[PDB]
Amino acid sequence: RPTIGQQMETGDQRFGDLVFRQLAPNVWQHTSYLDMPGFGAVASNGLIVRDGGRVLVVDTAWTDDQTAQILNWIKQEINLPVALAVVTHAHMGGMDALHAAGIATYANALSNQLAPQEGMVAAQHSLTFAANGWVEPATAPNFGPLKVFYPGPGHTSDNITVGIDGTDIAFGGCLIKDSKAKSLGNLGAADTEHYAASARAFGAAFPKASMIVMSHSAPDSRAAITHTARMADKLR
């Protein structure tokens, strides 16, 4: 996979076939790659957050092996216990690795409901959401700076998003595409009626976030939210 070298920027750390980019004093992006027919290596991004004496993870890598490597990198570079992980959609591949490491995992109740038919291991805990989209705090105990928001159905019915309190960063998962994207990608499980409003709701939930991190593109400005919503407008 020679795609990794083209993708790396100054300051990125390669660890096996994983790449880590520091985004803030206590936040890193993790990136893994999967060879997909007719496209070669495709990037998937998540977050690693150092919160005092512990680490919080958002999303697995594509695979269990890659996810184990993320945990290896955390041990080496941060050396704090990983307390919990939040997974933002059912599509994840590395749940077993998190569980093997004794990390408590959380996902939208709907993600957990969809997991078996997707061939995914469910998270151990289900998040539920108020009618305003905000996670019910009893379902997300001790989440530290992670602010979890369900913006409505978009790329998938279960997609959730995560703001990192006290930073410029919000994570849009698969809902948000970068501001240069040519399409919204795979819409097979999308709600094409509500997608545009859901993308805008994510923006309104984290209005101060200037760095938008996403599942399949490098971090971008809020132009990513605007562009995603406008592409989504066209599907209605």
Side-chain angles (χ1 to χ4, degrees):
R1 285 168 185 173
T3 298
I4 300 190
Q6 173 271 317
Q7 294 277 306
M8 287 178 71
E9 303 276 10
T10 304
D12 286 352
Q13 297 180 21
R14 189 189 52 80
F15 185 84
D17 288 337
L18 289 278
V19 176
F20 301 88
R21 175 175 298 173
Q22 187 164 22
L23 304 177
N26 297 304
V27 182
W28 301 254
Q29 179 182 248
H30 69 74
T31 303
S32 55
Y33 295 87
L34 184 66
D35 209 342
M36 304 194 64
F39 291 106
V42 178
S44 182
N45 308 308
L47 293 172
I48 300 169
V49 180
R50 173 170 52 206
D51 174 37
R54 73 203 182 130
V55 169
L56 318 173
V57 170
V58 180
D59 282 338
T60 72
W62 295 97
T63 71
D64 275 324
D65 287 352
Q66 291 169 345
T67 300
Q69 286 277 63
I70 292 173
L71 303 183
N72 295 338
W73 179 90
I74 293 172
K75 179 126 201 192
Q76 183 157 322
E77 300 298 331
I78 298 169
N79 197 25
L80 293 170
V82 181
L84 62 92
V86 180
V87 171
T88 64
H89 55 278
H91 221 62
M92 310 96 72
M95 299 308 290
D96 281 329
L98 296 183
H99 294 166
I103 299 163
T105 54
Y106 294 77
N108 187 349
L110 179 51
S111 305
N112 289 334
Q113 184 171 357
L114 290 176
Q117 67 196 257
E118 298 304 322
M120 181 194 120
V121 176
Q124 290 166 332
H125 299 277
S126 289
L127 300 178
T128 60
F129 297 87
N132 63 15
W134 288 104
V135 74
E136 286 283 349
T139 71
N142 294 288
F143 263 41
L146 305 190
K147 300 295 181 282
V148 186
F149 180 70
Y150 173 65
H155 176 77
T156 58
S157 287
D158 62 318
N159 54 207
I160 62 172
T161 65
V162 186
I164 317 302
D165 190 62
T167 77
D168 295 329
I169 300 160
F171 184 75
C174 289
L175 179 70
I176 302 300
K177 320 305 171 174
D178 68 277
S179 65
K180 295 203 300 283
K182 71 178 83 187
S183 77
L184 295 159
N186 174 26
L187 297 169
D191 178 340
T192 58
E193 170 61 19
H194 298 111
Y195 198 146
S198 298
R200 294 186 171 101
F202 165 72
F206 305 107
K208 307 176 179 293
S210 59
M211 179 183 289
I212 308 301
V213 180
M214 303 159 257
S215 292
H216 302 293
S217 293
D220 201 357
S221 70
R222 297 180 72 86
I225 302 167
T226 300
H227 179 62
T228 292
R230 290 171 173 178
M231 286 196 291
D233 282 329
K234 298 181 173 185
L235 307 181
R236 309 181 63 243

